[PDB]
Design a protein around this ligand. Structure first.
Ligand SMILES: O=C(O)c1ccccc1-c1c2ccc(=O)cc-2oc2cc(O)ccc12
Ligand SMILES: O=C(O)c1ccccc1-c1c2ccc(=O)cc-2oc2cc(O)ccc12
Length: 133
């Protein structure tokens, strides 16, 4: 399917304005500095209708499994317990995280041989680029 373009192993190669985006999300100082340093590997896989996104770094190891359009519980190292929904909108994986009446969007798009990640929170944008690993 269309998810196959996202499937594979990805390595973080560039990050821009991630600290200012995490500040705007409400991420604490210690967690921002820890997350800001990490150069994660990201494994995106598909099994039936279930999408798995595994991240691996010196900071942590995370795993989320989900069905497109089906809301799920996601864990974060901040004062936020989030309800997330991931949908596929015209080739773009749109990840909406909602907590305490607020929301942030993480968009992933395929550009050349890269996975371009756009994170938006109340006008503050961070761009992160991954390459195939
Ligand atoms: O994938 C990202 O780069 C990302 C962008 C905005 C907010 C969080 C992340 C992020 C993750 C988002 C979803 C997920 O399933 C796993 C993530 O893992 C990350 C690991 C990091 O070191 C650092 C960042 C992440
Ligand atoms: O919140 C975390 O556990 C975390 C810790 C280290 C590196 C990245 C994250 C991180 C996420 C990790 C996994 C995940 O599924 C979602 C994450 O979302 C984040 C969002 C932030 O604003 C800021 C950070 C994250």
């Amino acid at each position: 399917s269309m998810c196959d373009a996202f499937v594979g192993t990805w390595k973080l190669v560039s990050s821009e304005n991630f600290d200012d985006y995490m500040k705007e999300v409400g991420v604490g100082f210690a967690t921002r500095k820890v997350a800001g340093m990490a150069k994660p590997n990201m494994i995106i896989s598909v099994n039936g209708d279930v999408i798995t996104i595994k991240s691996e770094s010196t900071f942590k190891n995370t795993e989320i499994s989900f069905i497109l359009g089906q809301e799920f519980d996601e864990v974060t190292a901040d004062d936020r317990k989030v309800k997330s929904t991931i949908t596929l909108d015209g080739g773009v994986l749109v990840h909406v995280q909602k907590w305490d009446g607020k929301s942030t969007t993480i968009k992933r798009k395929r550009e050349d041989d890269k996975l371009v990640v756009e994170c938006v929170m109340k006008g503050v944008t961070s761009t992160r680029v991954y390459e195939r690993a």
